[PDB]
């Protein structure tokens, strides 16, 4: 089969900058003067969206800042000026022969100014404590870059092995990320302590920000 | 406007069979040049697996050939995907897509929403919804969707009326083998008394739909 390889695998570009994505096919996809290379844009949770067909034709409804070029085995997708809503994974696809194959995808992220997270801590609900399990959630809202460190402290005791982190995809509205850290304890272990703290360290934060609460207060 | 709506996803046993349907509305299925199925698995990009043209000619990807059948029902304006002898590698989000009458045909401008097929021997389990009450300016609140299987869970706020500031985090796999996620939203503190906030949780594999109101403790 024809294998497609894209480059780079991912990129982080400043907003408004020009973006170039290349796709190399293991065999030529030319046929009768046309090149059967297509490009797709896939945003989180959505189906792929057709941008370019036949190497250089712009699909109706797609902004004119997207353009394609190339022939034979080498093809290029160009974004003349990267916009915040262009955060997505981009795929090339050859339609020269079956099976119709896709590239591995190129993730495009917008590089914006450094922003500090808004930290919030949530105690476990009384509805959950009735089941015998406690979940303490710490929220880091709207920050950049994606790199953020979170560590828990239960009565000044650093926690380890009892938390999990989840990061959202880049928000096109402001090019920021959000992170949640969930500290999972048993109800008995939760009732034996008082202070539950969430310590957040980030580039946009000079000193680490700590938010905490007291159980039963 | 042409719409492709998929159904039939969910949990399947290893060695079992899946049956997906793609109901087409606002467009006659007999008018499309071809109707296709394309699956997306993590680390595998996108893979075309089956097609059927307007005259009934079928074609399949050799990586699945022998255990796949694509069919059509013009009276119901629906085409189907049938796969048997399922393996864990068949776990993916399955899309239906329409081919083109132009420029080599086998590029896809219209897609369905995608449905997740999970090939596992584990059992389905409904989630528990717990509130993340706000502390009392911008306030943060949310819902905790804990212990469910398999994916996915969809979360909206106020039946879709509230979208601004919403962050639904990707699910994480707990050590118990069950998934868990949370969805938050930033709201003004002055609105905590007067504005009602309800998270709409839906877990179709377990037929569990919950509307949970979040208010200060």
Author numbering:
A (entry chain L): 1 to 217
B (entry chain H): 1 to 136, 142 to 222
Which of the paper's sentences describe this entry?
Immunoglobulin E (IgE) plays a central role in the allergic response, in which cross-linking of allergen by Fc∊RI-bound IgE triggers mast cell and basophil degranulation and the release of inflammatory mediators. Omalizumab is a clinically approved anti-IgE monoclonal antibody that binds to free IgE, also with high affinity, preventing its interaction with Fc∊RI. Instead, the Fab alone selectively crystallized in different crystal forms, but their structures revealed intermolecular Fab/Fab interactions that were clearly strong enough to disrupt the Fab/IgE-Fc complexes. Mutations were therefore designed to disrupt two recurring packing interactions observed in the omalizumab Fab crystal structures without interfering with the ability of the omalizumab Fab to recognize IgE-Fc; this led to the successful crystallization and subsequent structure determination of the Fab/IgE-Fc complex.
